[PDB]
């Protein structure tokens, strides 16, 4: 059970150059940012760093139940293929977190090229899967469920080794009256309220989807909107995978193509008890390569 | 001019015009309806063999394809090394182009790296100069699009596919209308031919360039990259929303002056549209 | 008596017959020593390190010293025995699979692995000193504390191995000199047995840390990481000349504060050099 | 071909007034050479590598005029590209492309902590840099300085040749120029001629495989050259040498790659392979 570094927001400030908004590619911090705050790029002595800055649907006794969340599970969890927390800052209205930079950014941002990155090859978006369920794994084995599985929540290092992030939803391993995470990946029955570590297993079948495909679970302007809508288009014979897999890639071959597609479906059953262990999701993408 | 292949030649340089794809272990390179492109080697040399596939329209295209590339030659428009026409196989023999077509690099077919803001210009750059030599030459293209865009071995913008020019320099029209909806002008749909329809496709060439979408996406909302313009022009979006997010480089008064040439050439009248001479220098002025 | 019984035939199913084949070529072998090889196994799902052991009754010593000292140590920074196998003159000996090898192979790279940043070689080294303070703590000397003998796991966890030569403390003799001559303390070269000299091969351990060389290297100038202190403190030379270049996150504080360390464990008498819970309070004070 | 002109003022804002810092640091400085030093910088939203020239002074614009007059002639994919330069005064700046993987120097010996190149990764830079090279000697131009620090990387790894300062159009010569580690043994008596450029690369293809820079003041052999006699004395083999970095690399295609760098590296350069021939070698070798 570790401690983290206690950092002070004006260090954090000057370290992000005032939290510019401007995105590295142009000269300035920004390097991605969700619902509960914004990531920068930091240098804290010689070390390049990630400082995620908290901000608000959310309350403010809610997001610092999330910031609480997510330092008690960092210092009991630590693997190879979950990012690793350096410190923070709680002084004041602002919540900062401090990572290890990650030079690969995200798994979202590599399987949509973002900033100009070359397409991952079908050999890297297997690695990242073994890594992204040998993650999940160790979570499931530490009784904790994530809450909230996608690939903008997969990160990936200098060598492109999976580390999922994001543990401000992360419950101790029933039902609830807040129901969250992001809709496009979420498991009929987490839609509902229930939390369950099958629920996880379905949010990495949709990421499995992402990363045969290239296509983002949500796509406003896509038809059909939905990547989920796509495994019923597939069961109905009315397409095959063949006709989704990423045309960015060259290396991509039928047998681990359909291999993938196999625990991505096995994933997706509606029925929670349906679904794989994550030690069967984990057996299954180790047997594919 | 060009060198008189057999088609027998072709067969053994194309490995039998293997279908499989170049990534595969084959030789097909890519396809339109008026044929197949496969990869060759003709004694060290790596070419293209374009197997082309109305009968006496399509052997029309063949010697139009012919007789342009033996007066116009320019930098920014692509060689023809040789041909073959014996028998039913009619086959055009081409430079072999390193990176393929703009639509594909857009695309990032075969996992290509995103083109950078930089290239995009210099490629918009090119095929507005070999438009130029084209309508000086008068010659109407009419099948401007990305896929007819070649890029060789430094990314030099190379136009393609002339079985469909014309000679110019004023508007007739045709019976048989030809060309690739997604970029048609309003008047080339209608079967007008002018030198003006071909700014039009090529103002649907530089918003593919900026949005790094292709012009026409059955399974996009909306499906034609046209209705993007009509989005911006009624304030329900910018184009800073649209612009490619694949590419680290792209600033907005660059992006802002590529779309304000892409908005004076998608003018749906076409004596509002500028000539290429004006096209090519309001590109020139943007970098 | 406190690990699981194995019998010889077992350990040969899951180490595939002891496949000699490195793990990057498809085999089981993953490293190896004078005493024995280290084959990956799988007993179910846990994947695991076999040791196969190859004087016969010298080697036996050896054995029981690693199931002795693992009996009575169990610490975080202390590598874990599973089992062990001793059924005729097949001596085996079972741990936990440590994902990333050994300090060793992970300073130099070894089958492709990305260089260590300095932020885990400090967890390294302040974990490798917690590990040996334990060992101290309860009256043992290593007397083999060398890179290749401090393990990671899947966080890179500093995890000391090798009990084999383990001994129960003051300063005695032997007429058998065991160890490295790369790493050993001149008293211990000389026959000496003192925790002492643990202190003095750690601190070649953070010498390796800091530069990313091994102890030893035939084919370099100097052959030893040892002359390298010699030219620092003769001001020949600096520590910021010898920091592994394959970092990107060391800075010149608490790379001098660990060479400090280092400099006050190489020294060569052995009563001036610094007690282990000195070392690990400077280690936690570094960072 | 018309490069943009930049004054030096512009360049020292671009440059954050080239800042000597590295930057893994959070500085400007990349790299340095004999002739300059490589700084990041900004020149709008294009990430850019600003070379300032340091010492010969009128040698010294001779190569800033050399490299500008070959960059406006060549114009390749596995070739680096002049974006601009500055003249203005004594202080000569050229502005180019910025790789994000740096050289194949520093990726060898994954300088700042990179992870170590594959031997799938390496094969295709040794066919990149034989493409890029291929080109000059097709357009006739000899590089004479052929070596792994200036083979840079981009984002997809492309190889591309870079320092054209000592370019010469394809005799002897008075001011002898080069690296000593990688130059041919008529270069380094002042003879210029396209197979002292096969000779240098061939000396490339060794650091691709062993991982060990060309010259290594604090290793024996102090040059790899050396460990070539020790092969070719039967006195050590190619197997021993392989970079251990490495995990994906095969015996087969390593012994054929290590067949075009004794090629390369022939003592009589008439029996040297030309350009072309190297080129297919390393196409037949994947
Ligand atoms: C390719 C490129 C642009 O160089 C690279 F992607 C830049 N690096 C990053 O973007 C990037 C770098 N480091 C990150 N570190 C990090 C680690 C753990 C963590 N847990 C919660 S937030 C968070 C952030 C995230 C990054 N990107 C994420 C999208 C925000
Ligand atoms: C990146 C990669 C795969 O190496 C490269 F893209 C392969 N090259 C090509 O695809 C590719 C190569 N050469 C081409 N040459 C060419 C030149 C003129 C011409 N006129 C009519 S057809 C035609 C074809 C076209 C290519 N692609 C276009 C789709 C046909
Ligand atoms: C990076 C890579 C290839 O995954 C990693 F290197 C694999 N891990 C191992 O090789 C590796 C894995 N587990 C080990 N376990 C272990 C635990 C205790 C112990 N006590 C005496 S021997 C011994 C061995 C050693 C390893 N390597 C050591 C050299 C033998
Ligand atoms: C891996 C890391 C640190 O991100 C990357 F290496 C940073 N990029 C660079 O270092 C790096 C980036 N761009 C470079 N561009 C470039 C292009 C052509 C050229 N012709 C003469 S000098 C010169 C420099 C060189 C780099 N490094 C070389 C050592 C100077």
Redo the contacts between chains.
């Keep these: 059970d570790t401690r983290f570094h206690s950092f002070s927001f004006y260090e954090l400030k000057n370290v992000t150059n005032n939290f510019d908004e401007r ?1 590295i ?3 300035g911090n920004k390097m991605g940012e969700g619902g509960f705050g914004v990531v920068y790029k930091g ?1 804290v ?4 760093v990630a400082v995620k800055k908290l901000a608000a649907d959310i309350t403010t006794e809610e997001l610092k139940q999330q910031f609480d969340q997510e330092i008690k599970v960092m210092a009991k969890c ?3 293929n979950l990012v690793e927390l ?1 410190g923070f800052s709680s002084d004041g209205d602002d919540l900062c977190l401090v990572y ?1 930079y990650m030079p690969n950014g995200s798994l979202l941002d590599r399987l ?8 991952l ?1 079908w050999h890297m978006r297997c690695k990242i899967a073994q890594g992204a369920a040998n993650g999940i794994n ?1 979570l499931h084995e530490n009784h904790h469920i994530h809450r909230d599985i996608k690939s903008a929540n997969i990160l990936l ?3 492109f ?1 999976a580390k999922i992030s994001d543990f401000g939803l992360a419950r101790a391993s029933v039902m609830t009256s807040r129901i969250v995470g992001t809709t496009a990946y979420m498991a009929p029955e987490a839609l509902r309220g229930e939390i369950t570590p099958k629920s996880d297993i379905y949010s990495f079948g949709v990421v499995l989807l992402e990363i045969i495909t290239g296509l983002p679970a949500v796509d ?5 909107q939905l990547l989920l809508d796509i495994k019923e288009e597939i069961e109905d014979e009315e397409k095959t995978i063949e006709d989704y897999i990423d ?5 991509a071959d039928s047998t681990s193509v359909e291999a993938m597609y196999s625990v991505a479906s096995q994933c997706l059953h509606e029925k929670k008890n349906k679904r794989p262990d994550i ?1 069967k999701v984990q ?1 299954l993408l180790q047997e594919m390569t």
Excluded: I, W
């Design positions: 995105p590619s142009v000269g240098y002595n010689n070390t390049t630590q693997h190879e350096l290890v949509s090229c973002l900033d100009g990155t070359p397409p090859s160790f290092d200098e060598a080794t406003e302007h896509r038809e059909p045309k960015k890639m060259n290396d030690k057996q």
